[PDB]
Ligand binder design. Structure first.
Ligand code: SF4
Lengths: 271, 271
């Protein structure tokens, strides 16, 4: 079993890319589990064809504690047999995202859900703090893949996630597997992300293009793999899945300074 | 002295709106202090004409601890006498973003920097956790203004911040003074934000349009008030400032559910 975490800032289609990648993995015969560690809890909608999956936090609140919770309600099987579970966001203004994530992971481990080829933690990378770095810090995810784009905020979040990895890459076995470039139809975006990965010492594992079929499948609460298996974007997600399966470059990144990031953006025509 | 917090998700120009509002306030004769509570620390650049102001956490690290710091290096005066502080983001992957704010506010209180007509805490509202809600929880900010837009994520963040205000309003005195609509050139965006404010039990205090002069001023690292005083956007920021000064409608919000927000987006042609 491989423990991978997809990190990245919100609003760039990270969850859709994660779900389509997991669907492509399931289509290859891999038993994949998705754990959504996002407060929005949108990391399992496409696999489950659901408007909203009941997160562990909400069901614990309805049942008092996670101790009186059942894995059958917590964990749901979606397309391709993919198991789906939502950690649940913090209480707005009160709790930590990290406490919800660790509670979900501990409940899953106690219930025996992990006993699978891949476990993907879809973790928010908008802010890189102790709470959102729980999978990295508690040795829950060993391979970190960052979904980014050719915009200042996306690469800044990627660099901060790399800083967190570097913090926990010593006295720990968590490594950066690569960068997934979610295209935003920006010119020289793939080249910019390749250069950013080279600066970080990692690779751009795959460049995910923008396609209308992604939104067409998302209207149906479905992945591109399930919706149109013969689409070109399905082949892109299959290539990403194969490159993640065959990924051997797991490195401790070298985070860049702010000036280097601005220089990269100037070089590739963003600012 | 009025203690206010500008909350809101990132990527919608909340920081620029806050800095222009503070510049318009100082242009009317009010003594304002900006406390930047975002980890990326861009809340005081346009006032100070700086690429990036040195944050409290950085100086604490360079000087060993906060107790070896001086207000001269921490507190900087920019355009119109506005006093600028950056709280300092957490160490990526380790610290909590809300304890840097605790440290900054405590240090400013010991240094006597709070004894001023307005204090504005620019607080990021991407994730509404116990850390990022420190000014609301610790009773440091009494009036909350949420900068939002017609996009789904901005309205979701506004609803979550309203939930936090509700949690801390039945025990403290923190209230929501209105919603600031940061236009994204979306059709029926002002009407949608007005409807959201009416559902929350509050008001859309001002509609901030999109203007190129905002970007022209930001390139020069200054606000529109200082760059082009005779511009229309400067007048919009002045209207927002005088509506903030004259604001008396401070309410405990009524946060709306997922279905209500989705139906609001459906009504005005966004979903
Ligand atoms: S550690 Fe991060 S998620 Fe947890 S309360 Fe602090 S800022 Fe919020």
């Amino acid at each position: 079993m491989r423990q991978c975490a997809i990190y990245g800032k919100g609003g760039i289609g990270k969850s859709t890319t994660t779900q389509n990648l997991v669907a492509a993995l399931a289509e290859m015969g891999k038993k994949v589990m998705i754990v959504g560690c996002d407060p929005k809890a949108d990391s399992t909608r496409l696999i489950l064809h659901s408007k909203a999956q009941n997160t562990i936090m909400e069901m614990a609140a309805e049942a008092g504690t996670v101790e009186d919770l059942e894995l059958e309600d917590v964990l749901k099987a979606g397309y391709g047999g993919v198991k789906c579970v939502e950690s649940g966001g913090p209480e707005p203004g009160v709790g930590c995202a990290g406490r919800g994530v660790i509670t979900a992971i501990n409940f899953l481990e106690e219930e025996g859900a992990y006993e699978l080829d891949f476990v993907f933690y879809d973790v928010l990378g908008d802010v890189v703090c102790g709470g959102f770095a729980m999978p990295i810090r508690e040795n829950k995810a060993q391979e970190i893949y960052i979904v980014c784009s050719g915009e200042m905020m996306a690469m800044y979040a990627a660099n901060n996630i790399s800083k967190g990895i570097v913090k926990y890459a010593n006295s720990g076995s968590v490594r950066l597997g690569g960068l997934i470039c979610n295209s935003r139809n920006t010119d020289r975006e793939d080249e910019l992300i390749i250069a950013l990965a080279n600066k970080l010492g990692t690779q751009m594992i795959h460049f995910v293009p923008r396609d209308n079929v992604v939104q067409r499948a998302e209207i149906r609460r479905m992945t591109v793999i399930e919706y149109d298996p013969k689409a070109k974007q399905a082949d892109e997600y299959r290539a990403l899945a194969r490159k993640v399966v065959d990924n051997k470059l797991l490195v401790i990144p070298n985070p860049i300074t702010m000036d280097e990031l601005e220089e990269l953006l100037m070089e590739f025509g963003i600012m």
